[PDB]
Design a binder for this molecule. Structure first.
Ligand SMILES: CCOc1cc(Cl)ccc1-n1c(CN2CCNCC2)nc2ccc(F)cc2c1=O
Length: 181
């Protein structure tokens, strides 16, 4: 089931610029000044979707065209927001990412290298709560499976997870965009 995802402003790390529609996010040129509510990611440029999922099946698409790094997927709502962590299946995160413009990996511990034929301009996330799966699909390549976590022992609600980059050092100015449908 198609989910209409929007970004939660309360989770967004200071370094992030959300669109006004809540459907787009880019890494910014310096921190912004906002509060330090407990829901906000202090240590890395991450933000959640507003939707919580307690059950059922949910699909959404993210445009990543041009970007040299990024991280997508799903996480426990109960993940710590304050401080340092890895994006690991062991630690409440079901993610894939592009690092360094060339290296796709999936957030196993330790992570798993992905060899993609067609580099994705667009990525699908499919959450099946009851199955205990999070699946990533390469839309550019007609929906080929990028990677799938299974036997995820979902307890409590989950959130869509996003990060458009780690350091604006490069030109990671382009946004993650949530696609219509
Ligand atoms: C590929 C780069 O990975 C990282 C880079 C930095 Cl600067 C900080 C943390 C990580 N990272 C991370 C988090 N980063 C992943 C890549 N995108 C940025 C966040 N997750 C991991 C999960 C499992 C594992 F075995 C290792 C890692 C890991 O090293």
């Amino acid at each position: 089931s198609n989910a209409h995802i929007t970004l939660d402003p309360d989770t967004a790390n200071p370094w992030l610029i959300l669109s006004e529609d809540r459907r787009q996010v880019r890494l910014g040129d310096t921190q912004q000044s906002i509060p330090g509510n407990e829901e906000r990611f202090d240590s890395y440029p991450m933000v959640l979707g507003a939707q919580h999922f307690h059950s059922g099946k949910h699909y959404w698409e993210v445009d990543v065209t041009g970007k040299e790094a990024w991280d997508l997927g799903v996480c426990r709502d109960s993940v710590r927001r304050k401080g340092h962590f890895l994006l690991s299946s062991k630690s409440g995160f079901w993610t894939i990412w592009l690092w360094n413009k060339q290296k796709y990996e999936a957030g196993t511990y330790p992570q798993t290298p992905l060899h993609l034929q067609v580099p994705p301009c667009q990525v699908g996330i499919f959450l099946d709560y009851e199955a205990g799966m999070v699946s990533f699909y390469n839309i550019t390549d007609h929906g080929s499976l990028i990677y799938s976590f299974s036997e995820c022992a979902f307890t409590g609600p989950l959130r869509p997870f996003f990060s458009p980059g780690f350091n604006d050092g490069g030109k990671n100015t382009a946004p993650l965009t949530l696609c219509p449908l």
